[PDB]
Amino acid sequence: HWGYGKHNGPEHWHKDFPIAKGERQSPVDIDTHTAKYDPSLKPLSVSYDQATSLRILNNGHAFNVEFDDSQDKAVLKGGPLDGTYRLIQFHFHWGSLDGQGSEHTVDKKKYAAELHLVHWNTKYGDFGKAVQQPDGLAVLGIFLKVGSAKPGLQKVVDVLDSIKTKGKSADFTNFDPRGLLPESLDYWTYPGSLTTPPLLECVTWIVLKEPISVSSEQVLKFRKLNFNGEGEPEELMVDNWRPAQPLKNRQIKASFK
Ligand SMILES: N#Cc1ccc(Cn2cncn2)cc1-c1ccc(OS(N)(=O)=O)c(Cl)c1
């Protein structure tokens, strides 16, 4: 099945998932000088005070921190969004070296990693229904650069040893995603898709301008994860990012001057 290798990676996905070559694919390069400031964008509202994490898991593509989304406990609203989007999980994409790893790029610059906080439109009742809708999901993307450590990330990095290989999961309660946010909520936004199969074109992307800094030690621990299942030859979980896709008929809007 699909992956990030030479024989199953991004250039191959279109055979099983034709929408790979579709009209609103993600990620994209964000050209900062051509993005249009939009004064009609309401302020972004991130309400994670009641977020209830459950589990962390290695699915062979990334690691995933899963949340209890059975009530409106952690939601994203405002900005370009209509209605209420509920946090379901977060994951990251990262590189083998600090000069690559992000999926979105900013004037062609690649960051060391990118955080995706995934949310679904309540109006659709569940995630599975939401992904069949053009406004089904809102994914908050946050760039990571390597510099000072991110204290709020440490709890995640310390549990990664327990989910080394594909199919491993661990208890992961009481983790506060607010600890992963930068100071500014300035953002770019555009209509796009999931960056992995099934690549469904159901995402309103909200990408924050300001990166967070993580330490070399923190990102090194991401890179010790495995794509393989337990007992297989070790294949390091690195470079699990899709490259920038054609912008086609889309305008990227900016919340800031
Ligand atoms: N669809 C789906 C999905 C389902 C489950 C999980 C975690 N999981 C839980 N149990 C097993 N796996 C993650 C995703 C998932 C992956 C990539 C995505 O795309 S994206 N990168 O653009 O954020 C989006 Cl929007 C969602």
Ligand SMILES: [Zn+2]
């Ligand atoms: Zn992602």
